[PDB]
Design an enzyme around this catalytic site. Structure first.
Site, PDB file in Angstrom:
ATOM      1  N   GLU A 172      42.671  10.425 -48.190  1.00 19.67           N
ATOM      2  CA  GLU A 172      41.335  11.017 -48.230  1.00 19.67           C
ATOM      3  C   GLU A 172      40.437  10.766 -47.023  1.00 19.67           C
ATOM      4  O   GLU A 172      40.532   9.713 -46.326  1.00 19.67           O
ATOM      5  CB  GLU A 172      40.699  10.294 -49.515  1.00 19.67           C
ATOM      6  CG  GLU A 172      39.224  10.408 -49.715  1.00 19.67           C
ATOM      7  CD  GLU A 172      38.784   9.634 -50.999  1.00 19.67           C
ATOM      8  OE1 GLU A 172      39.629   8.810 -51.609  1.00 19.67           O
ATOM      9  OE2 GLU A 172      37.556   9.891 -51.354  1.00 19.67           O
ATOM     10  N   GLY A 222      45.907  -1.803 -34.210  1.00 21.16           N
ATOM     11  CA  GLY A 222      46.971  -2.403 -35.050  1.00 21.16           C
ATOM     12  C   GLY A 222      47.314  -1.704 -36.343  1.00 21.16           C
ATOM     13  O   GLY A 222      48.399  -1.853 -36.933  1.00 21.16           O
ATOM     14  N   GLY A 256      41.197   7.403 -34.027  1.00 23.03           N
ATOM     15  CA  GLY A 256      41.284   6.052 -33.450  1.00 23.03           C
ATOM     16  C   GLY A 256      42.696   5.513 -33.587  1.00 23.03           C
ATOM     17  O   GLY A 256      43.561   6.112 -34.309  1.00 23.03           O
ATOM     18  N   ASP A 262      32.432   4.303 -40.324  1.00 29.77           N
ATOM     19  CA  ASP A 262      32.812   2.981 -40.871  1.00 29.77           C
ATOM     20  C   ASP A 262      31.666   1.990 -40.737  1.00 29.77           C
ATOM     21  O   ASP A 262      30.648   2.217 -40.062  1.00 29.77           O
ATOM     22  CB  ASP A 262      34.116   2.485 -40.319  1.00 29.77           C
ATOM     23  CG  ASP A 262      34.039   2.012 -38.854  1.00 29.77           C
ATOM     24  OD1 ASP A 262      32.989   1.689 -38.331  1.00 29.77           O
ATOM     25  OD2 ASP A 262      35.136   1.903 -38.221  1.00 29.77           O
ATOM     26  N   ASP A 311      42.312  -8.126 -45.890  1.00 28.16           N
ATOM     27  CA  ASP A 311      41.703  -7.824 -44.601  1.00 28.16           C
ATOM     28  C   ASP A 311      40.349  -7.179 -44.819  1.00 28.16           C
ATOM     29  O   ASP A 311      39.928  -6.238 -44.135  1.00 28.16           O
ATOM     30  CB  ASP A 311      42.621  -6.921 -43.707  1.00 28.16           C
ATOM     31  CG  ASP A 311      42.245  -6.960 -42.246  1.00 28.16           C
ATOM     32  OD1 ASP A 311      41.528  -7.873 -41.765  1.00 28.16           O
ATOM     33  OD2 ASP A 311      42.672  -5.958 -41.502  1.00 28.16           O
TER      34      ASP A 311
HETATM   35  C1  LIG Z   1      38.774   8.037 -41.477  1.00 29.13           C
HETATM   36  C2  LIG Z   1      39.439   6.881 -40.882  1.00 29.13           C
HETATM   37  C3  LIG Z   1      39.103   6.469 -39.641  1.00 29.13           C
HETATM   38  N1  LIG Z   1      39.892   5.469 -39.462  1.00 29.13           N
HETATM   39  C4  LIG Z   1      39.951   4.623 -38.283  1.00 29.13           C
HETATM   40  C5  LIG Z   1      40.125   5.544 -36.936  1.00 29.13           C
HETATM   41  C6  LIG Z   1      38.741   3.712 -38.097  1.00 29.13           C
HETATM   42  F1  LIG Z   1      37.590   4.412 -37.851  1.00 29.13           F
HETATM   43  C7  LIG Z   1      38.896   2.706 -37.037  1.00 29.13           C
HETATM   44  C8  LIG Z   1      38.197   1.349 -37.539  1.00 29.13           C
HETATM   45  N2  LIG Z   1      37.738   1.756 -38.899  1.00 29.13           N
HETATM   46  C9  LIG Z   1      38.564   2.891 -39.353  1.00 29.13           C
HETATM   47  C10 LIG Z   1      40.721   5.236 -40.590  1.00 29.13           C
HETATM   48  N3  LIG Z   1      41.641   4.164 -40.697  1.00 29.13           N
HETATM   49  C11 LIG Z   1      42.376   4.070 -41.862  1.00 29.13           C
HETATM   50  C12 LIG Z   1      43.269   2.974 -41.943  1.00 29.13           C
HETATM   51  N4  LIG Z   1      43.179   2.006 -40.991  1.00 29.13           N
HETATM   52  O1  LIG Z   1      44.071   2.788 -42.907  1.00 29.13           O
HETATM   53  C13 LIG Z   1      42.131   5.027 -42.844  1.00 29.13           C
HETATM   54  C14 LIG Z   1      41.130   6.070 -42.666  1.00 29.13           C
HETATM   55 CL1  LIG Z   1      40.874   7.181 -44.021  1.00 29.13          CL
HETATM   56  C15 LIG Z   1      40.435   6.100 -41.496  1.00 29.13           C
END
Ligand SMILES: Cc1cn([C@@H](C)[C@]2(F)CCNC2)c2nc(C(N)=O)cc(Cl)c12
Length: 271
Positions: free
Chosen positions: A87, A14, A11, A94, A133
């Site tokens: 990790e 922002g 994904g 989520d 957040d």
């Molecule tokens: C495993 C993972 C998936 N994502 C994102 C692509 C989301 F799925 C998008 C909205 N919630 C996290 C992550 N985002 C973050 C971040 N924003 O710091 C960190 C992780 Cl481990 C992940």
């Protein structure tokens, strides 16, 4: 890179762009997060001079055996970006996607999840870090173990006891004193976001969309929710910051008694 094999993009937004990957030395699942230098709100400094995104400073502060916050495994600097290796639980979802699929959560499930988010926020505060957040998009669920992990410290700050007058977290989780005065203190602003989160878990959507609804702070329930749970939510969403509960008062509230441990939660609720 030859340390990690990059997989699909999970994904972007922002928070940057986040890919699935594997660490080549031991096949460990990781998430690889790229953040552009021009979009970093805040910078910190490592004990040694290196200017890094604040997020890197804050994740190092929160490191330990404690599993409730995503671990930073490594980070790299490129000419126009930083790359964070984090990790990655597997299988994972989520909490935003989980609520989208299941709708409002059963209260025993919400209580286990909310408790684990309070343990993780208490660990951040004890380490001197404010996330700023907290929201269902920033909570991952390890589906096999029932364990939740807080992610994304890119809007966070070091915790302090004086007023904050900047904010760049998510406005519909932000408290009435931020909307009205552009001023809040860290723990009470965190507890207001926890109130929003608890409402989202047990109702399946956040309570407020507009600034005027946040300022008025009147909560209505569209779903059946027990009186003890509605009391806790309305306490955390007290309009005066000093009327909100501390973290100890939240974990001592009658609704928070008798919590399932994470594995028990996965066996009962997770497919
Ligand atoms: C495993 C993972 C998936 N994502 C994102 C692509 C989301 F799925 C998008 C909205 N919630 C996290 C992550 N985002 C973050 C971040 N924003 O710091 C960190 C992780 Cl481990 C992940």
């Amino acid at each position: 890179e030859s340390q990690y094999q990059v997989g699909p993009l999970l994904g972007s937004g922002g928070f940057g762009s986040v890919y699935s990957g594997i660490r080549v030395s031991d096949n460990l699942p990781v998430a690889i997060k790229h953040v552009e230098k021009d979009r970093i709100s805040d910078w910190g400094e490592l004990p040694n001079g290196t200017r890094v995104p604040m997020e890197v400073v804050l994740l190092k502060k929160v490191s330990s055996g404690f599993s409730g916050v995503i671990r930073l495994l490594d980070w790299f600097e490129r000419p126009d970006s930083f790359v964070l290796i984090l990790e990655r639980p597997e299988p994972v979802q989520d909490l935003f996607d989980f609520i989208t699929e299941r709708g409002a959560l059963q209260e025993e499930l919400a209580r286990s999840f909310f408790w684990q988010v309070l343990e993780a926020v208490r660990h951040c505060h004890n380490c001197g870090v404010l996330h700023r957040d907290i929201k269902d998009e920033n909570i991952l669920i390890d589906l096999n173990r029932g364990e939740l992990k807080l992610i994304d410290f890119g809007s966070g700050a070091l915790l302090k006891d004086t007023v904050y007058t900047d904010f760049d977290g998510t406005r519909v989780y932000s408290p009435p004193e931020w909307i009205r005065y552009h001023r809040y203190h860290g723990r009470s602003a965190a507890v207001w976001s926890l109130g929003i989160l608890l409402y989202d878990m047990v109702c399946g959507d956040i309570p407020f969309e507009h600034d005027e609804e946040i300022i008025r702070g009147q909560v209505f329930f569209r779903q059946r929710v027990s009186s003890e749970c509605q009391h806790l939510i309305r306490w955390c969403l007290a309009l005066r910051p000093s009327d909100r509960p501390t973290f100890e008062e939240i974990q001592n509230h009658p609704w928070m008694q008798d919590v399932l441990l994470p594995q028990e939660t996965a066996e009962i609720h997770l497919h």
